Amino acid sequence: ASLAADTPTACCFSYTSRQIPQNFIADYFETSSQCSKPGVIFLTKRSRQVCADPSEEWVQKYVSDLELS
Amino acid sequence: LAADTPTACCFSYTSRQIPQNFIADYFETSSQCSKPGVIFLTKRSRQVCADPSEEWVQKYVSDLELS
Amino acid sequence: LAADTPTACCFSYTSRQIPQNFIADYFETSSQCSKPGVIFLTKRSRQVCADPSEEWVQKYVSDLELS
Amino acid sequence: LAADTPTACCFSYTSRQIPQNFIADYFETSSQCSKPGVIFLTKRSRQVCADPSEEWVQKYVSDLELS
Amino acid sequence: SLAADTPTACCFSYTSRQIPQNFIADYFETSSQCSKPGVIFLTKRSRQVCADPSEEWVQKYVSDLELS
Ligand SMILES: O=C(O)[C@@H]1O[C@@H](O)[C@H](OS(=O)(=O)O)[C@@H](O)[C@@H]1O[C@H]1O[C@H](COS(=O)(=O)O)[C@@H](O)[C@H](O)[C@H]1NS(=O)(=O)O
Ligand SMILES: OC[C@H]1O[C@@H](O)[C@H](O)[C@@H](O)[C@@H]1O
Ligand SMILES: OC[C@H]1O[C@@H](O)[C@H](O)[C@@H](O)[C@@H]1O
Ligand SMILES: OC[C@H]1O[C@@H](O)[C@H](O)[C@@H](O)[C@@H]1O
Ligand SMILES: OC[C@H]1O[C@@H](O)[C@H](O)[C@@H](O)[C@@H]1O
Ligand SMILES: OC[C@H]1O[C@@H](O)[C@H](O)[C@@H](O)[C@@H]1O
Ligand SMILES: OC[C@H]1O[C@@H](O)[C@H](O)[C@@H](O)[C@@H]1O
Ligand SMILES: OC[C@H]1O[C@@H](O)[C@H](O)[C@@H](O)[C@@H]1O
Ligand SMILES: OC[C@H]1O[C@@H](O)[C@H](O)[C@@H](O)[C@@H]1O
Ligand SMILES: OC[C@H]1O[C@@H](O)[C@H](O)[C@@H](O)[C@@H]1O
Ligand SMILES: OC[C@H]1O[C@H](O)[C@H](O)[C@@H](O)[C@@H]1O
Ligand SMILES: [Cl-]
Ligand SMILES: [Cl-]
């Protein structure tokens, strides 16, 4: 399973301005609803975490492909 | 150097007293976070959200800085 | 792990292409920065701001991601 | 004492005041940054962005500079 | 870990003759904002010497420092 104890929560306060190349994407996560602002956190193959605006539609297809695979 | 990176925000503090002997480092959460918080790091690299308004925490923060 | 920490921004870009053999890592600058930028880290631990519009810059980033 | 190195900018200041004896050093941010900023260095080498307008920030800088 | 409001290092004159490589301790390339592109070699005597980045030996010294 997955343990979720007293542990910091990953929240986004600033999204990327430029669309990440999909072939750089390795995985995705979504910020907890407790966060003040929404956000999607893409994990690049270089293991970098990038905040992305979920309202923007390029991040939404990226999630679709990741899930539907 | 990292950019557009998520910000660590505590939403649940630990109620107990942490053995200071286990503490290795500390980080106070961002002001952008909805609530204040301090993240202690243990020697097993385990991040723990702690309440800054509580007082065993600032003592740990003080001793970590004043050193 | 940090909070209320400064952000790396590029206000000028290198005029010469860095030999790829020197490249250790890369970091794209924050969207909050006034200008676009890529920060290449060399093996001598030099931090160089590069123009993301240059094709050699885009290639280096691609190679680092696909490795 | 510079190069085409990235620049330290502040986009988020700390809300509450830092205890003074935590501060080890300071330096203002470049004017090229979209926002003004004062970066306090703690005794644990941790960098904190501070609002130059705030009363305590100006006082901390004053004390550091008169030593 | 980044720069502030200070004076950027610029080279307005390079060096005609080649520094003995075993004198070189480190190197820094000047900003592109400068008029002339330059390389600053730091000697073991902690001295700073400007150098033409397009010269044969300068590129070699930088290469040897990086690949170490
Ligand atoms: O030599 C080549 O053909 C390689 O691809 C070229 O496109 C690169 O030119 S660059 O874009 O114009 O400046 C060359 O630098 C490159 O030589 C490389 O060798 C390896 C492998 O390349 S990578 O794409 O396959 O993985 C690597 O160390 C560098 O990518 C590059 N190093 S080099 O020796 O400095 O040129
Ligand atoms: O305050 C530091 C800031 O750094 C930026 O690079 C991030 O995108 C923000 O999420 C963060 O708040
Ligand atoms: O993290 C576990 C620790 O909890 C503390 O409350 C106890 O006093 C310690 O004995 C124990 O090691
Ligand atoms: O297409 C989007 C582009 O964004 C830039 O910021 C990156 O440096 C490129 O690698 C990428 O191709
Ligand atoms: O802000 C004033 C500072 O003065 C320095 O000389 C001291 O070393 C610090 O302990 C103090 O915080
Ligand atoms: O600092 C001494 C330097 O001497 C040079 O000749 C070497 O190439 C470097 O690896 C070394 O760092
Ligand atoms: O001497 C060689 C150098 O001369 C300078 O005036 C130019 O700006 C550079 O492009 C050139 O590399
Ligand atoms: O001005 C003459 C010099 O120009 C430099 O840019 C070249 O690297 C040298 O080879 C040449 O001797
Ligand atoms: O010592 C290294 C040598 O490398 C050669 O490629 C250069 O032409 C010489 O100027 C230099 O002295
Ligand atoms: O040493 C200088 C040489 O380094 C090599 O890695 C590349 O071919 C160029 O950057 C240059 O010709
Ligand atoms: O590519 C990175 C982007 O983010 C930066 O904020 C720039 O304002 C924008 O022009 C650039 O395209
Ligand atoms: Cl929040
Ligand atoms: Cl800016």
Coordinates of C-alpha atoms and ligand atoms in Angstrom, one line a residue:
Chain A
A1 CA 0.0 0.0 0.0
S2 CA 1.0 3.6 0.5
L3 CA 1.8 5.3 3.8
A4 CA 0.7 8.9 4.3
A5 CA 1.9 10.1 7.8
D6 CA 2.8 13.5 9.0
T7 CA 4.7 14.4 5.8
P8 CA 5.0 17.5 3.6
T9 CA 2.4 17.9 0.9
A10 CA 3.5 18.8 -2.6
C11 CA 1.6 22.0 -3.6
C12 CA 1.9 24.2 -6.7
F13 CA 2.1 27.9 -6.6
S14 CA 3.7 28.4 -10.0
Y15 CA 3.1 26.5 -13.3
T16 CA 5.4 26.0 -16.2
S17 CA 4.8 28.5 -19.1
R18 CA 6.0 26.3 -21.9
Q19 CA 4.6 22.9 -22.9
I20 CA 6.9 20.0 -21.9
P21 CA 7.8 17.6 -24.7
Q22 CA 5.7 14.5 -24.0
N23 CA 8.7 12.2 -24.6
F24 CA 10.3 13.9 -21.6
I25 CA 7.4 12.9 -19.3
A26 CA 7.9 9.8 -17.2
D27 CA 4.9 10.0 -14.8
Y28 CA 2.3 12.4 -13.4
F29 CA 0.9 13.2 -10.0
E30 CA -1.8 15.6 -8.8
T31 CA -1.5 18.0 -5.9
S32 CA -3.7 17.3 -2.9
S33 CA -7.0 19.1 -2.8
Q34 CA -5.8 20.7 0.5
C35 CA -3.5 22.9 -1.6
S36 CA -4.6 26.5 -2.1
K37 CA -4.1 26.3 -5.9
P38 CA -4.7 23.2 -8.2
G39 CA -1.9 21.6 -10.1
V40 CA -0.4 18.6 -11.9
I41 CA 3.1 17.5 -11.2
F42 CA 4.8 15.8 -14.1
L43 CA 7.9 13.7 -13.5
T44 CA 10.5 14.0 -16.3
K45 CA 12.8 11.1 -17.2
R46 CA 15.6 13.2 -15.5
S47 CA 13.5 12.8 -12.4
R48 CA 12.5 16.5 -12.3
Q49 CA 9.2 17.6 -10.8
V50 CA 7.3 20.3 -12.8
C51 CA 4.1 22.0 -11.8
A52 CA 1.6 22.3 -14.6
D53 CA -1.7 24.1 -14.9
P54 CA -4.5 21.4 -15.0
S55 CA -6.8 23.9 -16.8
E56 CA -4.4 24.0 -19.8
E57 CA -5.4 21.2 -22.2
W58 CA -1.9 20.0 -23.1
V59 CA -1.4 18.7 -19.6
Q60 CA -4.7 16.9 -19.8
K61 CA -3.8 14.8 -22.8
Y62 CA -0.5 14.0 -21.2
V63 CA -2.4 12.6 -18.2
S64 CA -4.8 10.7 -20.6
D65 CA -1.9 9.0 -22.4
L66 CA -0.1 8.1 -19.1
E67 CA -3.3 6.6 -17.6
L68 CA -4.6 5.0 -20.7
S69 CA -1.4 2.9 -21.2
Chain B
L1 CA 18.2 26.1 -9.2
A2 CA 15.1 23.9 -9.6
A3 CA 12.2 25.6 -11.3
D4 CA 8.4 25.3 -11.3
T5 CA 8.9 22.7 -8.6
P6 CA 6.1 21.9 -6.1
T7 CA 6.4 23.5 -2.7
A8 CA 6.5 21.4 0.5
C9 CA 3.5 22.2 2.6
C10 CA 2.5 20.7 6.0
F11 CA -1.2 20.0 6.5
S12 CA -0.8 17.6 9.4
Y13 CA 1.6 18.1 12.3
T14 CA 2.9 15.4 14.6
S15 CA 1.3 15.6 18.1
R16 CA 4.2 13.8 19.9
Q17 CA 7.6 15.0 21.0
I18 CA 10.3 13.8 18.6
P19 CA 13.6 12.7 20.2
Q20 CA 16.0 15.5 19.2
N21 CA 18.7 12.8 18.9
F22 CA 16.9 11.7 15.8
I23 CA 16.8 15.1 14.2
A24 CA 19.3 15.8 11.4
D25 CA 18.0 19.0 9.8
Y26 CA 15.0 21.4 9.7
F27 CA 13.1 23.3 7.0
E28 CA 10.3 25.9 7.6
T29 CA 7.5 25.7 5.1
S30 CA 6.8 28.5 2.6
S31 CA 4.7 31.5 3.5
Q32 CA 2.6 30.7 0.4
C33 CA 1.3 27.6 2.2
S34 CA -2.2 28.0 3.7
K35 CA -0.8 27.1 7.1
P36 CA 2.6 27.5 8.9
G37 CA 4.8 24.5 9.5
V38 CA 8.3 23.1 10.1
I39 CA 9.7 20.1 8.4
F40 CA 12.2 18.1 10.5
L41 CA 14.6 15.7 8.8
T42 CA 15.7 12.5 10.6
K43 CA 18.9 10.6 10.1
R44 CA 16.9 8.1 8.1
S45 CA 15.9 10.9 5.8
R46 CA 12.3 10.9 6.9
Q47 CA 10.4 14.2 6.6
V48 CA 8.1 15.1 9.4
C49 CA 5.7 18.0 9.6
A50 CA 5.8 19.8 13.0
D51 CA 3.8 22.6 14.5
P52 CA 5.9 25.9 14.9
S53 CA 3.3 27.4 17.3
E54 CA 4.1 24.4 19.6
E55 CA 7.3 24.9 21.6
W56 CA 9.4 21.8 21.5
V57 CA 9.8 22.6 17.8
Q58 CA 11.3 26.1 18.1
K59 CA 13.7 24.7 20.7
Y60 CA 14.8 22.2 18.0
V61 CA 14.9 25.0 15.4
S62 CA 17.0 27.2 17.8
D63 CA 19.5 24.5 18.7
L64 CA 19.9 23.6 15.0
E65 CA 20.6 27.2 14.0
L66 CA 22.7 28.2 17.0
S67 CA 25.2 25.5 16.1
Chain C
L1 CA 14.1 21.0 -0.1
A2 CA 13.6 24.7 0.5
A3 CA 10.9 27.4 1.1
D4 CA 10.8 31.2 0.5
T5 CA 14.1 30.5 -1.3
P6 CA 15.5 32.7 -4.2
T7 CA 14.8 31.7 -7.8
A8 CA 17.5 31.3 -10.5
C9 CA 16.9 33.5 -13.5
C10 CA 18.9 34.2 -16.6
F11 CA 19.4 37.8 -17.9
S12 CA 22.1 37.0 -20.3
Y13 CA 23.1 33.9 -22.4
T14 CA 26.5 32.5 -23.3
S15 CA 27.7 33.5 -26.8
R16 CA 29.7 30.3 -27.3
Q17 CA 28.4 26.8 -27.5
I18 CA 29.6 24.7 -24.5
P19 CA 31.3 21.4 -25.6
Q20 CA 28.8 18.7 -24.7
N21 CA 31.6 16.7 -23.0
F22 CA 31.5 19.4 -20.3
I23 CA 27.8 19.1 -19.6
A24 CA 26.9 17.4 -16.3
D25 CA 23.3 18.5 -15.9
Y26 CA 20.6 21.0 -17.0
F27 CA 18.0 23.2 -15.3
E28 CA 15.3 25.2 -17.1
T29 CA 14.6 28.5 -15.4
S30 CA 11.3 29.4 -13.7
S31 CA 8.4 30.8 -15.7
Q32 CA 8.4 33.6 -13.1
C33 CA 11.7 34.8 -14.5
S34 CA 11.5 37.8 -16.9
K35 CA 13.3 35.9 -19.6
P36 CA 13.5 32.3 -20.8
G37 CA 16.7 30.4 -20.0
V38 CA 18.5 27.0 -19.5
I39 CA 21.1 26.6 -16.9
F40 CA 23.8 24.1 -17.8
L41 CA 25.9 22.6 -15.1
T42 CA 29.5 21.7 -16.1
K43 CA 31.7 19.0 -14.6
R44 CA 33.9 21.8 -13.2
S45 CA 30.6 22.9 -11.6
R46 CA 30.1 26.0 -13.7
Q47 CA 26.6 27.4 -14.0
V48 CA 26.0 28.8 -17.5
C49 CA 22.9 30.5 -18.8
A50 CA 22.0 29.4 -22.3
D51 CA 19.4 30.7 -24.8
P52 CA 16.7 28.0 -25.2
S53 CA 16.1 29.2 -28.8
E54 CA 19.5 28.0 -29.9
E55 CA 19.3 24.5 -31.5
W56 CA 22.4 23.2 -29.7
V57 CA 20.8 24.1 -26.4
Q58 CA 17.6 22.2 -27.2
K59 CA 19.7 19.2 -28.3
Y60 CA 21.7 19.0 -25.1
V61 CA 18.5 19.1 -23.0
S62 CA 17.0 16.3 -25.1
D63 CA 20.1 14.1 -24.7
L64 CA 20.1 14.6 -21.0
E65 CA 16.4 13.7 -20.7
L66 CA 16.8 10.6 -22.9
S67 CA 19.6 8.8 -21.0
Chain D
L1 CA 33.4 38.8 -9.5
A2 CA 30.7 37.5 -11.9
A3 CA 30.0 35.7 -15.2
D4 CA 27.0 34.7 -17.3
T5 CA 25.8 33.0 -14.2
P6 CA 22.2 32.9 -13.2
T7 CA 20.8 35.6 -11.0
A8 CA 19.1 35.2 -7.6
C9 CA 15.6 36.7 -7.7
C10 CA 12.8 36.8 -5.2
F11 CA 9.2 36.1 -6.1
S12 CA 8.0 35.1 -2.6
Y13 CA 9.0 36.7 0.6
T14 CA 8.8 35.2 4.1
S15 CA 5.6 36.2 5.9
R16 CA 6.7 36.1 9.5
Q17 CA 10.0 37.5 11.0
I18 CA 13.1 35.5 11.4
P19 CA 14.9 35.5 14.8
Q20 CA 17.9 37.8 14.4
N21 CA 20.6 35.4 15.8
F22 CA 19.7 33.0 13.0
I23 CA 21.0 35.4 10.5
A24 CA 24.6 35.0 9.4
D25 CA 24.8 37.2 6.3
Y26 CA 22.8 39.1 3.6
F27 CA 22.8 40.5 0.1
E28 CA 20.2 42.4 -2.0
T29 CA 18.9 41.0 -5.2
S30 CA 19.7 42.4 -8.7
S31 CA 17.6 45.2 -10.1
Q32 CA 17.1 43.1 -13.2
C33 CA 14.7 41.0 -11.1
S34 CA 11.0 41.8 -11.5
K35 CA 10.7 42.2 -7.8
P36 CA 13.0 43.8 -5.2
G37 CA 14.4 41.5 -2.6
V38 CA 16.8 40.9 0.3
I39 CA 18.2 37.4 0.7
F40 CA 19.2 36.5 4.3
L41 CA 21.7 33.7 4.8
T42 CA 21.2 31.7 8.0
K43 CA 23.9 30.0 10.1
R44 CA 22.9 26.8 8.4
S45 CA 23.7 28.3 5.0
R46 CA 20.0 28.4 4.1
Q47 CA 18.8 31.3 1.9
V48 CA 15.6 33.2 2.8
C49 CA 13.9 35.9 0.7
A50 CA 12.7 38.9 2.6
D51 CA 10.7 42.0 1.7
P52 CA 13.0 45.1 1.7
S53 CA 10.0 47.3 2.7
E54 CA 9.5 45.4 5.9
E55 CA 10.8 47.1 9.1
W56 CA 12.7 44.2 10.5
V57 CA 14.5 43.4 7.2
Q58 CA 16.0 46.9 7.1
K59 CA 17.0 46.6 10.7
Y60 CA 18.8 43.2 10.2
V61 CA 20.7 44.6 7.3
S62 CA 21.6 47.7 9.3
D63 CA 23.1 45.6 12.1
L64 CA 25.0 43.3 9.8
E65 CA 26.6 46.3 8.0
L66 CA 27.7 48.1 11.2
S67 CA 29.9 45.2 12.2
Chain E
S1 CA 24.2 30.4 -5.1
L2 CA 23.8 33.1 -7.6
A3 CA 25.0 36.6 -8.5
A4 CA 23.9 40.0 -7.1
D5 CA 24.4 43.7 -8.0
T6 CA 28.1 43.8 -8.5
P7 CA 30.8 44.3 -11.2
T8 CA 30.9 41.6 -14.0
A9 CA 34.4 40.4 -14.9
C10 CA 35.3 41.5 -18.5
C11 CA 38.5 41.0 -20.6
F12 CA 39.5 43.9 -22.8
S13 CA 43.0 42.5 -23.5
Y14 CA 44.0 38.9 -23.9
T15 CA 47.4 37.3 -23.4
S16 CA 49.9 36.9 -26.3
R17 CA 52.0 34.1 -24.8
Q18 CA 50.8 30.8 -23.3
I19 CA 50.7 30.2 -19.5
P20 CA 52.5 27.0 -18.4
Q21 CA 49.6 24.6 -17.9
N22 CA 50.8 23.5 -14.4
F23 CA 50.3 27.1 -13.3
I24 CA 46.5 26.9 -14.0
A25 CA 44.3 26.1 -11.0
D26 CA 40.9 27.0 -12.4
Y27 CA 39.0 28.9 -15.1
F28 CA 36.0 31.2 -15.5
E29 CA 34.5 32.4 -18.8
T30 CA 33.4 36.1 -18.8
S31 CA 29.8 37.2 -19.4
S32 CA 28.5 37.5 -22.9
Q33 CA 27.4 41.1 -22.0
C34 CA 31.1 42.0 -22.2
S35 CA 32.4 43.5 -25.5
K36 CA 35.0 40.8 -26.0
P37 CA 34.4 37.1 -25.2
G38 CA 37.1 36.0 -22.7
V39 CA 38.4 33.3 -20.5
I40 CA 39.8 34.0 -17.0
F41 CA 42.4 31.5 -15.8
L42 CA 43.1 31.4 -12.1
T43 CA 46.6 30.5 -11.3
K44 CA 47.8 28.6 -8.2
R45 CA 49.2 31.9 -7.1
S46 CA 45.6 33.1 -7.1
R47 CA 46.2 35.4 -10.1
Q48 CA 43.7 36.2 -12.8
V49 CA 44.7 36.1 -16.5
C50 CA 42.4 37.0 -19.5
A51 CA 42.6 34.7 -22.5
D52 CA 41.2 34.5 -26.1
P53 CA 38.6 31.7 -26.1
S54 CA 39.3 31.0 -29.8
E55 CA 43.0 30.3 -29.3
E56 CA 44.2 26.7 -29.6
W57 CA 45.8 26.3 -26.1
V58 CA 43.0 28.1 -24.2
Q59 CA 40.4 25.6 -25.4
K60 CA 42.8 22.8 -24.4
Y61 CA 43.3 24.1 -20.9
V62 CA 39.6 24.5 -20.4
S63 CA 39.0 21.0 -21.7
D64 CA 41.6 19.5 -19.3
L65 CA 40.1 21.3 -16.4
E66 CA 36.5 20.2 -17.2
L67 CA 37.4 16.5 -17.8
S68 CA 38.8 16.1 -14.3
Ligands
LIG1 O1 29.6 14.0 -33.4 C1 28.4 13.9 -33.6 O2 27.9 13.5 -34.7 C2 27.5 14.0 -32.5 O3 26.2 14.6 -32.9 C3 26.3 15.9 -33.4 O4 25.0 16.4 -33.7 C4 26.9 16.9 -32.3 O5 27.0 18.2 -32.8 S1 26.4 19.3 -32.0 O6 24.9 19.4 -32.0 O7 26.3 20.2 -33.4 O8 27.2 20.4 -31.5 C5 28.2 16.3 -31.8 O9 28.7 17.2 -30.8 C6 28.1 14.9 -31.4 O10 29.3 14.4 -30.8 C7 28.8 13.8 -29.5 O11 29.3 12.6 -29.1 C8 28.6 12.0 -27.9 C9 27.3 11.3 -28.4 O12 26.3 12.2 -28.9 S2 24.8 12.1 -28.4 O13 23.8 12.7 -29.2 O14 24.7 10.8 -29.3 O15 24.5 11.3 -27.3 C10 28.3 13.0 -26.8 O16 29.4 13.1 -25.8 C11 27.9 14.4 -27.3 O17 26.5 14.4 -27.7 C12 28.8 14.9 -28.4 N1 30.1 15.2 -27.9 S3 31.2 16.0 -28.6 O18 32.4 15.2 -28.7 O19 31.6 17.1 -27.8 O20 30.8 16.5 -30.1
LIG2 O1 9.3 30.7 -3.7 C1 10.2 29.9 -4.6 C2 9.5 29.6 -5.9 O2 10.4 29.1 -6.8 C3 9.8 28.9 -8.1 O3 10.8 28.4 -9.0 C4 8.6 27.9 -8.0 O4 8.0 27.8 -9.3 C5 7.6 28.4 -7.0 O5 6.7 27.3 -6.8 C6 8.3 28.7 -5.7 O6 7.3 29.4 -4.8
LIG3 O1 9.8 7.6 16.9 C1 9.6 6.7 17.9 C2 9.9 7.3 19.2 O2 8.7 7.9 19.8 C3 9.0 8.6 21.0 O3 7.7 9.2 21.4 C4 9.4 7.6 22.1 O4 9.7 8.4 23.2 C5 10.7 6.9 21.6 O5 11.0 5.9 22.5 C6 10.5 6.3 20.2 O6 11.8 5.9 19.7
LIG4 O1 9.0 22.7 -27.4 C1 9.1 23.3 -26.1 C2 10.6 23.7 -25.8 O2 10.6 24.4 -24.6 C3 11.9 24.8 -24.3 O3 11.9 25.6 -23.1 C4 12.9 23.7 -24.1 O4 14.2 24.1 -23.9 C5 12.9 22.8 -25.4 O5 13.6 21.6 -25.2 C6 11.5 22.5 -25.8 O6 11.5 21.9 -27.1
LIG5 O1 21.8 40.6 12.7 C1 22.9 41.0 13.6 C2 24.0 39.9 13.5 O2 25.2 40.5 13.8 C3 26.3 39.6 13.5 O3 27.5 40.2 13.8 C4 26.2 38.3 14.5 O4 27.2 37.4 14.1 C5 24.8 37.7 14.3 O5 24.6 36.7 15.3 C6 23.7 38.7 14.4 O6 22.5 38.1 14.0
LIG6 O1 43.8 22.6 -9.0 C1 44.9 22.0 -9.7 C2 44.4 21.7 -11.1 O2 45.5 21.3 -11.9 C3 45.2 21.1 -13.3 O3 46.4 20.9 -14.0 C4 44.3 19.9 -13.4 O4 43.9 19.7 -14.7 C5 43.1 20.0 -12.5 O5 42.4 18.8 -12.4 C6 43.4 20.5 -11.1 O6 42.2 21.0 -10.5
LIG7 O1 39.9 38.3 -31.2 C1 38.8 37.4 -31.5 C2 37.5 38.0 -30.9 O2 37.5 39.4 -31.3 C3 36.4 40.1 -30.7 O3 36.5 41.4 -31.0 C4 35.1 39.5 -31.2 O4 34.0 40.1 -30.5 C5 35.0 38.0 -31.0 O5 33.9 37.5 -31.8 C6 36.3 37.3 -31.5 O6 36.3 36.0 -31.0
LIG8 O1 44.3 38.6 -34.1 C1 45.0 37.4 -34.5 C2 44.5 36.3 -33.5 O2 43.1 36.3 -33.5 C3 42.6 35.3 -32.6 O3 41.2 35.4 -32.5 C4 43.0 33.9 -33.1 O4 42.6 32.9 -32.1 C5 44.6 33.8 -33.2 O5 44.9 32.6 -33.9 C6 45.1 35.0 -34.0 O6 46.5 35.0 -33.9
LIG9 O1 50.8 22.6 -24.8 C1 49.6 22.3 -25.5 C2 49.8 22.7 -26.9 O2 48.6 22.3 -27.7 C3 48.7 22.6 -29.0 O3 47.6 22.1 -29.7 C4 48.8 24.1 -29.3 O4 49.0 24.4 -30.6 C5 50.0 24.7 -28.5 O5 49.9 26.1 -28.5 C6 49.9 24.2 -27.0 O6 51.2 24.6 -26.4
LIG10 O1 39.4 21.5 -27.0 C1 38.6 22.2 -27.9 C2 37.7 21.3 -28.7 O2 36.9 20.6 -27.7 C3 36.1 19.5 -28.4 O3 35.4 18.9 -27.4 C4 35.2 20.1 -29.4 O4 35.4 19.5 -30.7 C5 35.3 21.6 -29.5 O5 34.8 22.2 -28.4 C6 36.8 22.0 -29.7 O6 37.2 21.8 -31.0
LIG11 O1 10.2 29.6 -22.8 C1 10.1 30.0 -21.5 C2 9.0 31.0 -21.4 O2 8.9 31.6 -20.1 C3 9.4 32.9 -19.7 O3 8.5 33.4 -18.7 C4 9.3 33.9 -20.9 O4 8.5 35.0 -20.4 C5 8.6 33.3 -22.1 O5 8.7 34.3 -23.2 C6 9.3 32.1 -22.5 O6 8.8 31.6 -23.7
CL12 CL -1.7 26.0 0.4
CL13 CL 12.5 38.4 -13.3

